[PDB]
DNA sequence: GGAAATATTATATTCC
DNA sequence: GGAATATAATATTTCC
């Protein structure tokens, strides 16, 4: 249904989603390269990343 | 000095940035898979796209 | 310097 | 269902 961010207004489709979104705010980045260290905010990010890293 | 678009005001990086931009407004898609017809306002989007076919 | 490519990122869309 | 994936759009790096 309504999944609700209550601090930017936006709706979003799973709990996930809205979860994904939440780190926005928070900044949480829980996803870190192997090879270079860096943090991304989700784990698809991260795997196009792993793409520099031919 | 800048080049900011006439409609949302936006500022970007050189001439080719700005037009790019733009297409967000026109729905400007020059950019065709042969595969698919599907198309994108840049080179670099439906390139990625390519690779979603294999 | 600036076009171009590449990396980036937030979030719909996919899929039985 | 909800993680994987594809998208849209911009930001950074590359390249001549
Ligand atoms: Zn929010
Ligand atoms: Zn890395
Ligand atoms: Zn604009
Ligand atoms: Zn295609």
């Given at each position: ?24 705010h928070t900044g949480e980045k829980p996803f870190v ?22």
């Amino acid at each position: 249904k309504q999944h609700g961010c209550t601090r930017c207004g936006k709706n979003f489709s799973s709990a996930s989603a809205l979860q994904i979104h939440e780190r926005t705010h928070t900044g949480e980045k829980p996803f870190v390269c192997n090879i270079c260290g860096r943090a991304f905010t989700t784990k698809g990010n991260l795997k196009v990343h792993y793409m520099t890293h031919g």
